[PDB]
């Protein structure tokens, strides 16, 4: 077995959160919000003199893709869900449609909020992010998400071409079996690193979807086949070292005319529509901090390879991964 592999797997067991289809609690919290949307739309549409439109819900985000992590103490669960409203996009304003959902959920938990990309509802210990889409069958065959808030300049308010199930299919399908298992472990490892080392400034933290898209482009399996038994052993430390090095190699110094300097930027295109850079909202200074911490993680992953003492290998990794990374006693 590869050095530190046991402690990586132990760390993975401690940080992993069971996906929607294996997590009753998450299914219930989701369905509660979906139910409240149905009840709430009735009242919103009583004032407009017709039945509320129906919607088809579908699972989104990490809890759909089986890349979910437990939040740190005092953090929140992030339940991502899509609702496809039975509406023609050309007949309605994206913000109008999100307002229906917001007003439907006004008196639910700690309230609700129109965001650029979703309506978020807040509960004690979690938020539900409802991505709101128009019916492709009434919108010319395209699935469009409702983008914009009231404060949006009307250029940032639109029905944008979207492919959440294509993205989810791409993450599911890149690899199979135990290869796909290591891919998913390495995404969870980076998400716990993110939560541990980007807690001072939440807005500077690399988005989950960015780390997931980065793994889609750049993750390579690391495993070894014993030449006698043909018995396959995974090397998560090496897989993470190669993946972190490849992310670092993809940073580009980017001129900023305001500050009259460059910042190192990592561009990560979504592999599906709308093919946007999911890191575009991260500032140059946030990107430089992201790069330095990624370099520090890369250095720790190399240190963990060379150490005489398993204690010293694990301790070097725990400094980047936090309190769930096992450190065997010297
Ligand atoms: O193809 C796309 C485009 C965009 N999105 C948008 O990404 C959001 C999920 O983005 P998150 O950052 O929540 O991603 P995640 O769930 O994979 O990661 P963690 O929370 O575990 O950190 C969804 O709420 C949707 O609006 C997709 O899910 N798919
Ligand atoms: Mn999420
Ligand atoms: Mn979310």
UniProtKB/TrEMBL annotation:
Per UniProt, where does GTP 2 bind?
116-118, 133
- Give the source's domain of life in one word: Bacteria
Q: Please tell me where dATP 1 binds in this chain.
A: 62, 191, 194, 276
Residues recorded as binding CTP 2, renumbered to this chain, are 62, 191, 194
Entry binding sites for Mg(2+): 78, 80, 129
This enzyme catalyses: GTP + ATP = 3',3'-cGAMP + 2 diphosphate
Annotated GO biological processes are:
defense response to virus; nucleotide metabolic process
Binding residue positions for Mn(2+)? 78, 80, 129
Entry binding sites for CTP 1: 62, 163, 191, 194, 209, 273
The entry marks the following residues as binding CTP 3, namely 80, 116-118, 129
Q: Which residues form the Cyclic GMP-AMP synthase DncV-like nucleotidyltransferase domain?
A: 58-133
> Which parts of the sequence bind UTP 3?
62, 191, 194, 209
Which residues are listed for ATP 2 binding in this entry? 80, 115-118
Q: Where does UTP 1 bind?
A: 60, 80, 116-118
Binding of ATP 3 occurs at: 116-118, 149
Keywords (alphabetical) are: Antiviral defense, ATP-binding, GTP-binding, Magnesium, Metal-binding, Nucleotide metabolism, Nucleotide-binding, Nucleotidyltransferase, Plasmid, Transferase
By what name is this protein known?
Cyclic GMP-AMP synthase
Tell me which species this is from.
Deinococcus wulumuqiensis
């Amino acid at each position: 077995m590869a050095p530190v592999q046991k402690q990586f797997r132990e760390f993975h067991d401690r940080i992993k959160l069971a996906q929607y289809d294996e997590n009753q609690t998450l299914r219930d919290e989701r369905d509660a919000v979906l139910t409240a949307v149905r009840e709430g739309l009735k009242k919103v549409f009583a004032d407009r003199g017709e039945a509320a439109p129906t919607f088809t819900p579908f699972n989104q985000g990490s809890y759909a893709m089986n890349t979910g992590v437990k939040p740190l103490e005092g953090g929140e669960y992030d339940i991502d869900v899509g609702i496809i409203l039975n509406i023609a996009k050309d007949d309605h304003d994206p913000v109008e449609v999100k307002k229906w959902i917001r007003d439907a959920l006004k008196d639910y938990g700690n309230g609700a909020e129109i965001r650029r990309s979703c309506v978020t509802v807040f509960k004690p210990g979690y938020h539900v992010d409802l991505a709101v889409y128009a019916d492709p069958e009434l919108s010319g065959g395209t699935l469009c998400i409702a983008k914009g808030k009231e404060n949006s300049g009307d250029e940032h308010r639109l029905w944008q071409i979207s492919d959440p199930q294509g993205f989810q299919d791409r993450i599911a399908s890149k690899l199979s079996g135990d290869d796909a298992a290591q891919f998913r472990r390495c995404i969870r490892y980076l998400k716990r690193w993110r939560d541990f080392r980007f807690s001072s400034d939440g807005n500077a933290a690399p988005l989950g979807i960015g780390l997931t898209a980065a793994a889609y482009w750049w993750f390579q399996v690391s495993k070894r086949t014993d030449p006698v038994s043909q018995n396959v052993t995974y090397d998560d430390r090496d897989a993470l070292e190669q993946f972190v090095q490849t992310m670092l190699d993809n940073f580009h110094d980017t001129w900023d005319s305001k500050d009259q300097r460059s910042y190192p930027r990592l561009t990560v295109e979504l592999p599906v529509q709308p093919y946007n850079d999911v890191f575009e909202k991260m500032t140059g200074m946030q990107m430089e901090s992201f790069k330095s911490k990624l370099q520090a993680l890369l250095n720790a992953l190399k240190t963990a390879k060379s150490r005489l003492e398993l204690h010293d290998a694990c301790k070097a990794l725990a400094d980047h991964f936090g309190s769930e990374f096992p450190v065997p006693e010297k």
